[PDB]
Design an enzyme around this catalytic site. Sequence first.
Site, PDB file in Angstrom:
ATOM      1  N   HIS A  40       0.801  -1.214   0.000  1.00 25.27           N
ATOM      2  CA  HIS A  40       0.000   0.000   0.000  1.00 25.27           C
ATOM      3  C   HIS A  40       0.838   1.271   0.000  1.00 25.27           C
ATOM      4  O   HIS A  40       0.253   2.357  -0.063  1.00 25.27           O
ATOM      5  CB  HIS A  40      -0.985  -0.008   1.170  1.00 25.27           C
ATOM      6  CG  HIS A  40      -0.353   0.070   2.527  1.00 25.27           C
ATOM      7  ND1 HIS A  40       0.295   1.195   2.989  1.00 25.27           N
ATOM      8  CD2 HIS A  40      -0.325  -0.824   3.543  1.00 25.27           C
ATOM      9  CE1 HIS A  40       0.711   0.985   4.225  1.00 25.27           C
ATOM     10  NE2 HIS A  40       0.350  -0.234   4.584  1.00 25.27           N
ATOM     11  N   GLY A 142       3.728   6.280  10.634  1.00 27.90           N
ATOM     12  CA  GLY A 142       5.023   5.924  10.098  1.00 27.90           C
ATOM     13  C   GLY A 142       5.567   4.594  10.573  1.00 27.90           C
ATOM     14  O   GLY A 142       6.758   4.317  10.358  1.00 27.90           O
ATOM     15  N   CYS A 144       4.259   1.508   9.605  1.00 33.97           N
ATOM     16  CA  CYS A 144       4.061   0.411   8.662  1.00 33.97           C
ATOM     17  C   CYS A 144       5.392  -0.058   8.100  1.00 33.97           C
ATOM     18  O   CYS A 144       6.289   0.737   7.841  1.00 33.97           O
ATOM     19  CB  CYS A 144       3.148   0.831   7.498  1.00 33.97           C
ATOM     20  SG  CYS A 144       1.475   1.182   7.973  1.00 33.97           S
TER      21      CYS A 144
END
EC number: 3.4.19.12
Lengths: 298, 298
Positions: A40, A142, A144
């Site tokens: 993503h 932040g 991920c």
Amino acid sequence: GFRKMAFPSGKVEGCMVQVTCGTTTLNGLWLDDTVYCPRHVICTAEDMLNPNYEDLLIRKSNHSFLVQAGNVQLRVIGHSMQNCLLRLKVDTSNPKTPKYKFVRIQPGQTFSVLACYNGSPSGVYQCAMRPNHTIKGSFLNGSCGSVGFNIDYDCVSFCYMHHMELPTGVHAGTDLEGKFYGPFVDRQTAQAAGTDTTITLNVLAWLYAAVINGDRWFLNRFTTTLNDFNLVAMKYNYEPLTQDHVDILGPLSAQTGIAVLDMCAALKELLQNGMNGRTILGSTILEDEFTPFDVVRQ
Amino acid sequence: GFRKMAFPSGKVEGCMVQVTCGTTTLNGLWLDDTVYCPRHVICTAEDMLNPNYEDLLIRKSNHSFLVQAGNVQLRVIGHSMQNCLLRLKVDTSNPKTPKYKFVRIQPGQTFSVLACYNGSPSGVYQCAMRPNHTIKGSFLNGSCGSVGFNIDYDCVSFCYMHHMELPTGVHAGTDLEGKFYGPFVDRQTAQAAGTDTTITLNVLAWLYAAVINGDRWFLNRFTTTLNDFNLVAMKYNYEPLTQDHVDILGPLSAQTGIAVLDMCAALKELLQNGMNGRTILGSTILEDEFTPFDVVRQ
């Protein structure tokens, strides 16, 4: 005296990189000449509930992925998708690649998480894979791309990469083949986990840790049958104890001197009468994120 | 999702060495061309009842100190004593030495521990410097020399080196100038931790965290002066609040809309009436090793 410990994170910290596509930045894992990150990263605000990943990825080139390893930029010379991960081929092979493997952990098992922010490690903590395939972790913005892992002895077993926070505040993610744990999908739509349960095998392991630490106040002289205890377990949202579970606690039963079924009678009483304000290993709650192997290690 | 998190440990891992002296081995810290370790490495079991460290040290040569950095052996070129530390001048300068400082931690502040055994890192956890100058840690046999630390930007602030376990189960050690925290000494003697008090600053931070998480059954409309709160706190073995603590709680106060002194009046009620039966963040004991800084991160 007995506490959650995380593995030393140095071998993982040397693999953490920053991956930027367009106006989105998250963390990647750099092993040999491959960078793994959640797909993503290509999604801007079409994450909900429209993303056709095959469609969004065909329109990308190697140039559209900016990868930073500390100060240096790594040149992406290829890219492909595997389930919900991007695989970015880069020109440099990580000199700090440790011996590693990719494993898919089963519910109830624990691992360390190295929480990272735009490629830079920030904290490390121990957690467990819940029976309903979420993790109750600490993933800010932040985060991920951060990975979970176990180490033994010099080999890092990666088991988790973080993708999303759920409405209830728990976390969802994949193994390192990119398959989600649980029923979830990487799209910004409302998603429920199944109803969670307590990890009975880990509570028992932890009761042994208390006895092994000189805390016997909850023990008693009774005993119970496997089925007789599992009856109390269902009424209390504990997962059923299997016979192979009893065999995993075999070593701990011998060191403690308490037969497994006796510990179960103790647990049965603790579930029925509460703890009445006393503590087990400094906790007021029945801890279920220590495995038997965790308890043996300390 | 409020978890104790340790700083990533890699920058310290690359400094951990093994210092051997006769029959006893423990950990040392290798920065540049000096290795730091507890001076009781030179003691024998007999010498530990009343050692004369200056006597025991002159009776030793550089070639008495076996210093191992993994496979590699390091050659001790010189040796001195700084307080309760030995500083060993070594053959080679540590190629992995990071930016660092030596700081003296204050009661109530937290740090991370890299627990090590025979120079090999085993696990990382977070703990606090208690008011009675001990730490509630996890140190098994072989952990002496393990260090505690914080990381700000790229710089490691070393603050602790483990020396001893006290009879009550908690731990004592020094800063990296070899000065003990507390009145403790590196001899086998009748010493024991004084009465511990509770870190009120951190209990209040935890209450704010609980409010942020939707737990607020404990708030009330009474008010208290700083002085009257402090008089109650001390009678319950809670640390009195300083002027600076009130300021440190500013951010959390505004974020929640609960004046610092109003949260003090909440705590005052919990101290005088107890919590039974209610829970706070799932627990019936007020946590006191989570700092205002920890809470602010989430």
